[PDB]
Amino acid sequence: SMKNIESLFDYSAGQFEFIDHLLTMGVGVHFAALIFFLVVSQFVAPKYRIATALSCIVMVSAGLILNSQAVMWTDAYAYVDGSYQLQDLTFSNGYRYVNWMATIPCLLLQLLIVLNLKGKELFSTATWLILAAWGMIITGYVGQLYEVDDIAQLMIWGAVSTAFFVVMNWIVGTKIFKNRATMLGGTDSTITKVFWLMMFAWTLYPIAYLVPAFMNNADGVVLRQLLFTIADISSKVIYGLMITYIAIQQSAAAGYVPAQQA
Ligand SMILES: *C/C=C(C)/C=C/C=C(C)/C=C/C1=C(C)CCCC1(C)C
Ligand SMILES: CCCCCCCC/C=C\CCCCCCCC(=O)O
Ligand SMILES: CCCCCCCC/C=C\CCCCCCCC(=O)O
Numbered sequence: 255s256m257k258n259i260e261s262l263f264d265y266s267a268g269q270f271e272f273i274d275h276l277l278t279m280g281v282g283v284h285f286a287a288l289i290f291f292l293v294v295s296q297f298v299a300p301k302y303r304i305a306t307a308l309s310c311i312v313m314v315s316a317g318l319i320l321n322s323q324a325v326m327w328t329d330a331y332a333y334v335d336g337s338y339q340l341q342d343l344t345f346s347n348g349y350r351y352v353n354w355m356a357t358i359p360c361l362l363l364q365l366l367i368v369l370n371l372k373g374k375e376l377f378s379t380a381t382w383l384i385l386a387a388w389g390m391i392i393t394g395y396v397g398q399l400y401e402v403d404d405i406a407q408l409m410i411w412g413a414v415s416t417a418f419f420v421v422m423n424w425i426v427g428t429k430i431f432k433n434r435a436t437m438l439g440g441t442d443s444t445i446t447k448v449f450w451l452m453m454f455a456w457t458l459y460p461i462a463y464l465v466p467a468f469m470n471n472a473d474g475v476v477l478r479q480l481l482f483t484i485a486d487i488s489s490k491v492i493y494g495l496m497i498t499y500i501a502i503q504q505s506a507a508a509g510y511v512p513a514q515q516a
Protein backbone atom coordinates (compact mmCIF):
# COMPACT_ATOMS: atom_id res chain seq x y z
CA SER A 255 0.00 0.00 0.00
CA MET A 256 2.14 2.85 1.36
CA LYS A 257 5.13 0.57 0.64
CA ASN A 258 5.32 1.04 -3.15
CA ILE A 259 7.06 3.98 -4.80
CA GLU A 260 3.81 5.47 -6.13
CA SER A 261 3.20 7.00 -2.69
CA LEU A 262 6.50 8.94 -2.83
CA PHE A 263 5.75 11.40 -5.64
CA ASP A 264 3.41 14.09 -6.79
CA TYR A 265 2.41 13.73 -10.43
CA SER A 266 1.86 16.30 -13.14
CA ALA A 267 -1.49 16.21 -14.91
CA GLY A 268 0.22 14.66 -17.93
CA GLN A 269 1.62 11.78 -15.91
CA PHE A 270 -1.55 11.23 -13.86
CA GLU A 271 -4.08 11.26 -16.68
CA PHE A 272 -1.72 9.16 -18.81
CA ILE A 273 -1.67 6.40 -16.19
CA ASP A 274 -5.44 6.60 -15.74
CA HIS A 275 -5.89 6.41 -19.52
CA LEU A 276 -3.63 3.34 -19.63
CA LEU A 277 -5.66 1.49 -17.00
CA THR A 278 -9.04 2.42 -18.51
CA MET A 279 -7.81 1.51 -22.00
CA GLY A 280 -6.78 -1.87 -20.60
CA VAL A 281 -10.34 -2.34 -19.37
CA GLY A 282 -11.90 -1.77 -22.77
CA VAL A 283 -9.38 -3.97 -24.54
CA HIS A 284 -9.87 -6.95 -22.24
CA PHE A 285 -13.67 -6.71 -22.22
CA ALA A 286 -13.72 -6.25 -25.99
CA ALA A 287 -11.62 -9.39 -26.39
CA LEU A 288 -14.00 -11.25 -24.06
CA ILE A 289 -16.82 -10.74 -26.55
CA PHE A 290 -14.58 -12.19 -29.28
CA PHE A 291 -13.44 -15.18 -27.22
CA LEU A 292 -17.09 -15.71 -26.27
CA VAL A 293 -18.57 -15.63 -29.78
CA VAL A 294 -15.91 -17.97 -31.20
CA SER A 295 -16.40 -20.66 -28.54
CA GLN A 296 -19.07 -22.18 -30.80
CA PHE A 297 -16.51 -22.78 -33.59
CA VAL A 298 -14.34 -24.88 -31.23
CA ALA A 299 -14.64 -28.65 -30.86
CA PRO A 300 -15.52 -29.81 -27.32
CA LYS A 301 -11.93 -31.10 -27.07
CA TYR A 302 -10.32 -27.64 -26.95
CA ARG A 303 -13.33 -25.51 -26.00
CA ILE A 304 -12.16 -25.12 -22.39
CA ALA A 305 -9.11 -23.23 -23.68
CA THR A 306 -11.45 -20.50 -24.93
CA ALA A 307 -13.44 -20.37 -21.69
CA LEU A 308 -10.15 -19.90 -19.85
CA SER A 309 -9.44 -16.88 -22.04
CA CYS A 310 -12.83 -15.36 -21.17
CA ILE A 311 -12.14 -15.96 -17.48
CA VAL A 312 -8.74 -14.29 -17.95
CA MET A 313 -10.19 -11.30 -19.81
CA VAL A 314 -12.66 -10.60 -17.00
CA SER A 315 -10.16 -11.35 -14.24
CA ALA A 316 -7.59 -8.92 -15.62
CA GLY A 317 -10.31 -6.46 -16.62
CA LEU A 318 -11.80 -6.24 -13.13
CA ILE A 319 -8.39 -5.64 -11.55
CA LEU A 320 -7.46 -2.99 -14.11
CA ASN A 321 -10.82 -1.33 -13.53
CA SER A 322 -10.08 -1.49 -9.80
CA GLN A 323 -6.63 0.04 -10.29
CA ALA A 324 -8.18 2.83 -12.40
CA VAL A 325 -10.74 3.79 -9.74
CA MET A 326 -8.26 3.39 -6.90
CA TRP A 327 -5.84 5.57 -8.88
CA THR A 328 -8.36 8.42 -9.05
CA ASP A 329 -9.49 8.03 -5.43
CA ALA A 330 -5.94 8.30 -4.04
CA TYR A 331 -4.75 11.55 -5.67
CA ALA A 332 -6.27 15.02 -5.99
CA TYR A 333 -5.11 17.96 -8.10
CA VAL A 334 -3.83 20.50 -5.55
CA ASP A 335 -1.58 23.49 -6.27
CA GLY A 336 -0.74 22.39 -9.79
CA SER A 337 -0.02 18.71 -9.09
CA TYR A 338 -1.75 15.47 -8.12
CA GLN A 339 -0.91 14.65 -4.50
CA LEU A 340 -1.63 11.57 -2.43
CA GLN A 341 -4.90 11.99 -0.51
CA ASP A 342 -5.46 8.47 0.86
CA LEU A 343 -3.78 5.06 1.08
CA THR A 344 -5.69 3.05 -1.52
CA PHE A 345 -3.39 2.44 -4.53
CA SER A 346 -0.81 -0.34 -4.74
CA ASN A 347 0.41 -2.90 -7.25
CA GLY A 348 -0.02 -5.76 -4.76
CA TYR A 349 -3.48 -6.24 -6.28
CA ARG A 350 -1.84 -7.13 -9.59
CA TYR A 351 0.13 -9.83 -7.76
CA VAL A 352 -2.93 -11.31 -6.05
CA ASN A 353 -4.49 -11.36 -9.53
CA TRP A 354 -1.64 -13.20 -11.29
CA MET A 355 -2.19 -16.13 -8.91
CA ALA A 356 -5.46 -16.71 -10.77
CA THR A 357 -4.73 -15.71 -14.35
CA ILE A 358 -1.35 -17.47 -14.62
CA PRO A 359 -2.76 -20.99 -14.04
CA CYS A 360 -5.46 -20.26 -16.63
CA LEU A 361 -2.85 -19.07 -19.13
CA LEU A 362 -0.78 -22.22 -18.61
CA LEU A 363 -3.74 -24.57 -18.48
CA GLN A 364 -5.03 -23.55 -21.89
CA LEU A 365 -1.52 -24.04 -23.28
CA LEU A 366 -1.50 -27.65 -22.05
CA ILE A 367 -4.99 -28.11 -23.50
CA VAL A 368 -4.05 -27.21 -27.08
CA LEU A 369 -0.84 -29.25 -26.73
CA ASN A 370 -3.26 -32.23 -26.46
CA LEU A 371 -2.18 -33.40 -23.01
CA LYS A 372 -4.80 -35.43 -21.17
CA GLY A 373 -5.35 -37.27 -17.93
CA LYS A 374 -2.41 -38.06 -15.67
CA GLU A 375 0.06 -35.97 -17.68
CA LEU A 376 -2.36 -33.03 -17.80
CA PHE A 377 -2.95 -33.21 -14.04
CA SER A 378 0.71 -33.81 -13.16
CA THR A 379 2.18 -31.14 -15.44
CA ALA A 380 -0.53 -28.72 -14.34
CA THR A 381 0.34 -29.22 -10.67
CA TRP A 382 4.06 -28.52 -10.99
CA LEU A 383 3.58 -25.48 -13.24
CA ILE A 384 0.93 -24.00 -10.94
CA LEU A 385 3.12 -24.62 -7.89
CA ALA A 386 6.17 -23.16 -9.62
CA ALA A 387 4.10 -20.19 -10.80
CA TRP A 388 2.68 -19.52 -7.34
CA GLY A 389 6.12 -19.79 -5.78
CA MET A 390 7.23 -17.20 -8.32
CA ILE A 391 4.30 -14.92 -7.47
CA ILE A 392 4.54 -15.21 -3.68
CA THR A 393 8.28 -14.48 -3.54
CA GLY A 394 7.76 -11.69 -6.06
CA TYR A 395 4.97 -10.25 -3.91
CA VAL A 396 7.06 -10.24 -0.73
CA GLY A 397 9.90 -8.57 -2.63
CA GLN A 398 7.97 -5.50 -3.79
CA LEU A 399 6.81 -4.84 -0.22
CA TYR A 400 10.40 -3.56 0.13
CA GLU A 401 10.77 -1.69 -3.17
CA VAL A 402 10.80 1.49 -1.04
CA ASP A 403 12.40 0.41 2.24
CA ASP A 404 14.90 -2.34 1.33
CA ILE A 405 16.20 -2.53 -2.23
CA ALA A 406 18.55 -5.36 -1.25
CA GLN A 407 15.65 -7.54 -0.10
CA LEU A 408 13.90 -6.75 -3.38
CA MET A 409 16.89 -8.20 -5.24
CA ILE A 410 17.03 -11.32 -3.05
CA TRP A 411 13.31 -12.10 -3.32
CA GLY A 412 13.54 -11.38 -7.04
CA ALA A 413 16.36 -13.91 -7.38
CA VAL A 414 14.34 -16.53 -5.51
CA SER A 415 11.44 -15.58 -7.78
CA THR A 416 13.44 -16.00 -10.99
CA ALA A 417 14.49 -19.52 -9.98
CA PHE A 418 10.82 -20.57 -10.05
CA PHE A 419 10.33 -18.63 -13.30
CA VAL A 420 13.20 -20.46 -15.01
CA VAL A 421 12.14 -23.87 -13.71
CA MET A 422 8.63 -22.99 -14.89
CA ASN A 423 9.62 -22.08 -18.45
CA TRP A 424 11.90 -25.10 -18.70
CA ILE A 425 8.96 -27.43 -18.03
CA VAL A 426 6.81 -25.45 -20.48
CA GLY A 427 9.35 -25.69 -23.28
CA THR A 428 9.97 -29.36 -22.55
CA LYS A 429 6.31 -30.28 -23.07
CA ILE A 430 6.01 -28.12 -26.20
CA PHE A 431 9.11 -29.47 -27.94
CA LYS A 432 8.07 -33.04 -27.07
CA ASN A 433 4.37 -32.86 -28.01
CA ARG A 434 4.16 -30.48 -30.97
CA ALA A 435 4.33 -33.42 -33.38
CA THR A 436 0.90 -34.38 -32.02
CA MET A 437 -0.68 -31.12 -33.14
CA LEU A 438 -2.87 -30.86 -36.21
CA GLY A 439 -3.39 -28.47 -39.09
CA GLY A 440 0.24 -27.40 -38.96
CA THR A 441 -0.05 -25.84 -35.50
CA ASP A 442 3.19 -27.59 -34.54
CA SER A 443 4.63 -24.45 -36.12
CA THR A 444 2.29 -21.97 -34.44
CA ILE A 445 2.86 -23.39 -30.95
CA THR A 446 6.60 -22.69 -31.20
CA LYS A 447 5.77 -19.03 -31.89
CA VAL A 448 3.44 -18.91 -28.89
CA PHE A 449 6.20 -20.17 -26.60
CA TRP A 450 8.52 -17.31 -27.55
CA LEU A 451 5.69 -14.79 -27.19
CA MET A 452 5.41 -16.10 -23.63
CA MET A 453 9.17 -15.78 -23.12
CA PHE A 454 9.06 -12.18 -24.34
CA ALA A 455 5.80 -10.95 -22.78
CA TRP A 456 6.33 -12.49 -19.34
CA THR A 457 9.93 -11.24 -19.21
CA LEU A 458 8.60 -7.67 -19.17
CA TYR A 459 7.15 -8.19 -15.68
CA PRO A 460 10.44 -8.65 -13.77
CA ILE A 461 11.66 -5.57 -15.65
CA ALA A 462 8.66 -3.61 -14.35
CA TYR A 463 9.44 -5.11 -10.93
CA LEU A 464 12.96 -3.60 -11.03
CA VAL A 465 11.95 -0.04 -12.01
CA PRO A 466 12.14 1.25 -8.39
CA ALA A 467 15.78 0.12 -8.45
CA PHE A 468 16.98 2.00 -11.55
CA MET A 469 14.29 4.69 -12.03
CA ASN A 470 13.05 5.89 -8.63
CA ASN A 471 10.99 8.91 -9.76
CA ALA A 472 7.55 9.71 -11.19
CA ASP A 473 8.46 8.84 -14.77
CA GLY A 474 9.44 5.42 -13.43
CA VAL A 475 5.89 5.02 -12.16
CA VAL A 476 4.69 5.87 -15.66
CA LEU A 477 7.27 3.61 -17.32
CA ARG A 478 6.18 0.73 -15.06
CA GLN A 479 2.48 1.02 -15.89
CA LEU A 480 3.42 1.36 -19.56
CA LEU A 481 5.47 -1.84 -19.20
CA PHE A 482 2.68 -3.68 -17.36
CA THR A 483 0.25 -2.53 -20.07
CA ILE A 484 2.35 -3.92 -22.94
CA ALA A 485 2.86 -7.11 -20.94
CA ASP A 486 -0.85 -7.77 -20.30
CA ILE A 487 -1.97 -7.12 -23.89
CA SER A 488 0.71 -9.50 -25.16
CA SER A 489 0.47 -12.24 -22.51
CA LYS A 490 -3.33 -12.32 -22.19
CA VAL A 491 -4.97 -10.78 -25.26
CA ILE A 492 -2.56 -11.68 -28.06
CA TYR A 493 -1.55 -14.93 -26.37
CA GLY A 494 -5.17 -16.04 -26.08
CA LEU A 495 -5.83 -14.97 -29.66
CA MET A 496 -3.11 -17.43 -30.72
CA ILE A 497 -4.35 -20.15 -28.37
CA THR A 498 -7.73 -19.54 -30.01
CA TYR A 499 -6.36 -19.78 -33.55
CA ILE A 500 -4.63 -23.04 -32.57
CA ALA A 501 -7.83 -24.41 -31.04
CA ILE A 502 -9.91 -23.75 -34.16
CA GLN A 503 -7.28 -25.03 -36.59
CA GLN A 504 -6.89 -28.32 -34.73
CA SER A 505 -10.67 -28.55 -34.32
CA ALA A 506 -11.17 -28.27 -38.08
CA ALA A 507 -8.42 -30.79 -38.86
CA ALA A 508 -10.09 -33.27 -36.49
CA GLY A 509 -13.36 -33.00 -38.42
CA TYR A 510 -15.41 -30.45 -36.44
CA VAL A 511 -17.89 -28.90 -38.88
CA PRO A 512 -18.37 -25.46 -37.23
CA ALA A 513 -14.59 -25.06 -37.13
CA GLN A 514 -14.13 -26.07 -40.78
CA GLN A 515 -16.69 -23.43 -41.84
CA ALA A 516 -14.82 -20.68 -39.94
C1 LIG B 1 -1.05 -11.52 -17.18
C2 LIG B 1 0.06 -11.57 -16.23
C3 LIG B 1 1.14 -12.37 -16.28
C4 LIG B 1 1.32 -13.37 -17.38
C5 LIG B 1 2.15 -12.22 -15.21
C6 LIG B 1 3.33 -12.84 -15.21
C7 LIG B 1 4.32 -12.51 -14.18
C8 LIG B 1 5.61 -12.88 -14.11
C9 LIG B 1 6.24 -13.75 -15.15
C10 LIG B 1 6.40 -12.37 -12.97
C11 LIG B 1 7.68 -12.67 -12.74
C12 LIG B 1 8.59 -12.24 -11.66
C13 LIG B 1 9.83 -12.72 -11.64
C14 LIG B 1 10.29 -13.72 -12.66
C15 LIG B 1 10.88 -12.27 -10.65
C16 LIG B 1 10.56 -10.87 -10.14
C17 LIG B 1 9.16 -10.90 -9.56
C18 LIG B 1 8.14 -11.19 -10.67
C19 LIG B 1 6.85 -11.71 -10.04
C20 LIG B 1 7.88 -9.85 -11.34
C1 LIG C 1 -2.40 -26.53 -6.96
C2 LIG C 1 -3.84 -27.01 -7.14
C3 LIG C 1 -3.98 -27.96 -8.33
C4 LIG C 1 -3.46 -27.35 -9.63
C5 LIG C 1 -3.51 -28.38 -10.75
C6 LIG C 1 -4.70 -28.18 -11.67
C7 LIG C 1 -5.00 -29.47 -12.43
C8 LIG C 1 -5.67 -29.21 -13.77
C9 LIG C 1 -6.81 -30.19 -13.93
C10 LIG C 1 -7.79 -30.06 -15.02
C11 LIG C 1 -8.08 -28.69 -15.59
C12 LIG C 1 -9.23 -28.72 -16.60
C13 LIG C 1 -9.21 -29.98 -17.45
C14 LIG C 1 -9.94 -29.82 -18.78
C15 LIG C 1 -9.45 -30.88 -19.77
C16 LIG C 1 -10.46 -31.12 -20.89
C17 LIG C 1 -10.89 -32.58 -20.99
C18 LIG C 1 -12.40 -32.69 -20.87
O1 LIG C 1 -13.15 -31.83 -21.38
O2 LIG C 1 -12.92 -33.65 -20.26
C1 LIG D 1 6.43 -24.34 2.61
C2 LIG D 1 7.77 -24.56 3.31
C3 LIG D 1 8.90 -23.70 2.74
C4 LIG D 1 8.68 -23.27 1.29
C5 LIG D 1 9.93 -22.60 0.71
C6 LIG D 1 9.57 -21.36 -0.10
C7 LIG D 1 10.74 -20.88 -0.95
C8 LIG D 1 11.41 -19.67 -0.30
C9 LIG D 1 12.83 -19.54 -0.81
C10 LIG D 1 13.77 -18.65 -0.12
C11 LIG D 1 13.34 -17.25 0.27
C12 LIG D 1 14.31 -16.70 1.32
C13 LIG D 1 14.47 -15.19 1.24
C14 LIG D 1 14.64 -14.60 2.63
C15 LIG D 1 14.59 -13.08 2.62
C16 LIG D 1 15.77 -12.47 3.37
C17 LIG D 1 15.44 -11.07 3.85
C18 LIG D 1 15.29 -11.08 5.36
O1 LIG D 1 16.28 -11.00 6.12
O2 LIG D 1 14.15 -11.19 5.87
Ligand SMILES: [Cl-]
Nearest residue numbers: 316353354357
Ligand atom coordinates in the same frame (compact mmCIF):
# COMPACT_ATOMS: atom_id res chain seq x y z
CL1 LIG E 1 -3.73 -10.49 -14.10
